[PDB]
Symmetry: C3
Subunit: 154 residues, 3 copies
């Protein structure tokens, strides 16, 4: 009976969806996702901010954005080196915003940053945000390549 | 038509089952699973024993259990820090058992341990086991937060 | 309703396919795959050449093959120790070839290697190739256990 066959296949599909969910949970765990916390990950590849957004978006995630001191540190430990944050002031110079929308609710710039420096030569100012090794931020050219770090929801 | 479509979906479903199986195999390989052997995984998060148990169960695994000096070492190397073991004497004081049931067949107790100490001031004695320095065992309060290490079948 | 149920099943299957692809992409990313580049993975297990071959085959990959200095470095980075490469002269002594076909082009032989040595006492000469710590190559017995490193398509 086709109806029975169809019911059995719906049950098979539900089982596969449950197993894929488990595969995803285990993978996050193995990659360090802490209970109820956001998950940050990197392949350690350095690239232009435009490439990072495309990359994370292709992964159905978003460029890493620290909403406090903790998350900033986490993003720091995963990248291990200088990485772009999902923050820019490209739309309106001076007003930094999250790539997912909204004005900054937390920051940790460096003593003389942001300076929107134009002396970099790459043309234009500096509208992208990246982290250093000490955790401090610096506005740099989006054209410059830095470590790609994506984030996924808690 | 209908029966043809139904037969194809049967093929689609079986192909997806094989693909997810392959995905799990590769993930275990990248997590360091050795051929024909059980493997351990951690997210390096510290938490009370009750939480570790709940988390590993959610992952369809169990709390890490060393059955010999080899696995004991393996767990050590995966955790890097102090981690809980799936061994407790909660059912019968002084009689340590595997959370999966049964008496111990291998132990690596530190001298002067277990001692069911009440001096930690957390209440109750010590009914949980965790690995300390040199890979030795110590009984501690199930309330203390240690590294969660889950175990998956060979 | 039969047709409607079948149509929903089609959609469920397609969304599952989509999600699995996303899982595979994220996993490769987390394992270090660089954009447009093939990537190397290992479980850090040491085994004879035939075992490495069977393992990578089961995972739908091949034994790691350095096609240039850059990939040779990526492989030594991943392995962290001595590992077999998908290169042998089993078919025709002295004529090294890729396990996937074709004669060897790029090479990084250690001084005085290959030498098809028999003094190792394992029987026969040396028809398998492995990378050492420094990245240089040596021909050794396919019977010796070396680290398993598999590569997957760019
Ligand atoms: C990596 C970094 O800090 N780059 C900054 C650059 O963005 C600019 O602010 C410049 C001032 O002319 O100083 C540099 O240190
Ligand atoms: C030859 C062999 O053992 N292959 C297994 C493979 O089937 C799969 O179980 C994988 C899990 O990561 O581990 C490998 O060791
Ligand atoms: C981490 C650890 O080993 N803690 C133990 C504690 O459980 C208890 O046995 C105490 C006895 O005073 O000694 C400590 O060293
Ligand atoms: C790991 C390694 O390099 N083994 C080589 C061996 O293959 C053989 O060439 C021998 C010659 O005596 O030298 C060894 O160093
Ligand atoms: Ca600007
Ligand atoms: Ca700017
Ligand atoms: Ca700047
Ligand atoms: Ca099809
Ligand atoms: Ca006790
Ligand atoms: Ca104790
Ligand atoms: Ca549905
Ligand atoms: Ca030879
Ligand atoms: Ca040799
Ligand atoms: Cl810019
Ligand atoms: Cl306790
Ligand atoms: Cl050989």
């Amino acid at each position: 009976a086709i109806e029975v066959k169809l019911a059995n296949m719906e049950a098979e599909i539900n089982t596969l969806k449950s197993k894929l969910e488990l595969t995803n949970k285990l993978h996050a765990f193995s990659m360090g996702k802490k209970s109820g916390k956001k998950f940050f990950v990197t392949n350690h590849e350095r690239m232009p901010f435009s490439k990072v957004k495309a990359l994370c978006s292709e992964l159905r995630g978003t460029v890493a954005i620290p909403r406090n001191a903790e998350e900033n540190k986490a993003i720091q430990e995963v990248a291990k080196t200088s990485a772009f944050l999902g923050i820019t002031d490209e739309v309106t110079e001076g007003q930094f915003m999250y790539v997912t929308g909204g004005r900054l609710t937390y920051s940790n710039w460096k003593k003389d940053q942001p300076d929107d420096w134009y002396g970099h030569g790459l043309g234009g100012g500096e509208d992208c945000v990246h982290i250093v090794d000490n955790g401090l931020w610096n506005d740099d050219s989006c054209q410059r390549p830095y470590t790609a770090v994506c984030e996924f929801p808690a």
